[PDB]
Amino acid sequence: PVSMTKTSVDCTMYICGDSTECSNLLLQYGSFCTQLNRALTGIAVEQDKNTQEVFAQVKQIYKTPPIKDFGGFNFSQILPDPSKSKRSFIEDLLFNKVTFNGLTVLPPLLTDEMIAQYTSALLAGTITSGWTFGAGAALQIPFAMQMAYRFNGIGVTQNVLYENQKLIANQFNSAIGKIQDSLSSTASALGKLQDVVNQNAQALNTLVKQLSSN
């Protein structure tokens, strides 16, 4: 889980909105709902801050060249698809497999398309430059050389990598295909996000039915 739905709730509008007498009576309670409004807007701006700290950690949007020469590693399932928003196949599947009383949901500062663009920038800079785009300037590197350095990072020599690169690329492609199969068949993968949004919706429905309570 990353972000919550930005539930911004006006204190008065929720409790007894559109009532001058009740607003005056609530004014006698000091700053209960004033401090409550400030705290809830603080939760909202803090959720936006979390979104920024988790997505907008880079200040440059990178794009891959038209030739998807990644050394045999298919990425269209993870690279954004321009034929439709600018989301990928897996991203579109995730968007597909997962779907008025003073409680206004403020739109995120970073909408769906902007989040797609952030993700595109991040993963594209990754696949194109290893870790240099995050360290300093984006120094492009061959993907085979990147895998070589990663293998040298866990204690194995890249000689076996370059001997078995065909089988390794085939294994990565078949793993992308299996992950397509999984994220398309078993939607229990996003069960965590589903339970988070369900808890949010349940809290909202409880807050609403409280107005029905006596």
Partner 1 sequence: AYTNSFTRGVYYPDKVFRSSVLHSTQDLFLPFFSNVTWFHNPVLPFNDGVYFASTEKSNIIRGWIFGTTLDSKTQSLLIVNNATNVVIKVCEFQFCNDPFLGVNCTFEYVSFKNLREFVFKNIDGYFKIYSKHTPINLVRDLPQGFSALEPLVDLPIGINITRFQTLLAYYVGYLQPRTFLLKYNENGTITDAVDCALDPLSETKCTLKSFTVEKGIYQTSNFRVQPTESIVRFPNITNLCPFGEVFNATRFASVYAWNRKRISNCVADYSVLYNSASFSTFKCYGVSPTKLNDLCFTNVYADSFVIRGDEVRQIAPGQTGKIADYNYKLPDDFTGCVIAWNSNNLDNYNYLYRLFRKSNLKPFERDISTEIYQAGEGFNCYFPLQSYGFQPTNVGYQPYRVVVLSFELLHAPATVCGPKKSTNLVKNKCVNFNFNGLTGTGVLTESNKKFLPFQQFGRDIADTTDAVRDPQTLEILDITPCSFGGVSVITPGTNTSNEVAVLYQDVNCTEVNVFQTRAGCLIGAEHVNNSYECDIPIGAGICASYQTQSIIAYTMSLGAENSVAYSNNSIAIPTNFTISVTTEILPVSMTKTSVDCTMYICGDSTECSNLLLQYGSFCTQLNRALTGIAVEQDKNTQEVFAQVKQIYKTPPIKDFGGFNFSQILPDPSKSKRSFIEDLLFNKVTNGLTVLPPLLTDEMIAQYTSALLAGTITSGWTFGAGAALQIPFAMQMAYRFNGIGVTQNVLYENQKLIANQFNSAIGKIQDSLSSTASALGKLQDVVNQNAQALNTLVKQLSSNFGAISSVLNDILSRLDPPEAEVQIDRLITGRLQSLQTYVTQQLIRAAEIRASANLAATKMSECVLGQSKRVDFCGKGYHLMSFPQSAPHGVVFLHVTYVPAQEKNFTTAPAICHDGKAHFPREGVFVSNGTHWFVTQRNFYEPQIITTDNTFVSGNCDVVIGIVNNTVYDPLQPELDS
Residues in touch with ligand NAG (CB under 6 A): 67-69, 74
Burial of 176-201, coded b for 16+ CB within 10 Å and e otherwise, reads beeeeeebeeeeeeeeeeeebeeeee
Q: How far is the CB of 141 from ligand NAG (least distance, A)?
A: 13
Tell me, what amino acid is at 175? A
Which one of ligand NAG, partner 1, none interacts with residue 142, CB within 5 to 8 A by kind?
partner 1
- In whole angstroms, the minimum distance from the beta carbon of 69 to ligand NAG comes to 5
Partner touching 31 among partner 1, ligand NAG, none, CB below 5 to 8 Å by kind: partner 1
Task: Tell me how many residues contact partner 1 (CB under 8 A).
Answer: 110
Residue 117 interacting partner from partner 1, ligand NAG, none (CB closer than 5 to 8 Å by kind): partner 1
Q: Which of 20, 21, 83, 137 binds partner 1 (CB under 8 A)?
A: 137
Write the interaction track for partner 1 spanning residues 11-30; mark x where CB under 8 A is met and - where it is not.
Answer: --x----x------x--xxx
DSSP one-letter string for 145-156: HHHHHHHHHHT-
H/E element holding 90?
helix 89-97
Given CA atoms 109, 52, 195, 210 in this order, what sign does their dihedral have?
Answer: negative
Residues 23, 12 contacting (CB under 8 angstroms): yes
74 binds, among ligand NAG, partner 1, none (CB under 5 to 8 A by kind): ligand NAG
How many other C-beta atoms lie within 10 A of the C-beta of residue 140? 14
* Cβ count near 38 (within 10 Å): 12
Q: How far apart are CA 172 and CA 179, in angstroms?
A: 10
Which partner in ligand NAG, partner 1, none is near 68 (CB below 5 to 8 A by kind)? Answer: ligand NAG
- List the one residue from 66, 82, 153, 188 that touches partner 1 (CB under 8 A): 153
Which token pair is 71?
């050394």
* Tokens at 197, concatenated: 């949004």
* x-or-dash string of contact with partner 1, 154-193, rule CB under 8 A: xx-xxx--xx-x------x------x---------xx-xx
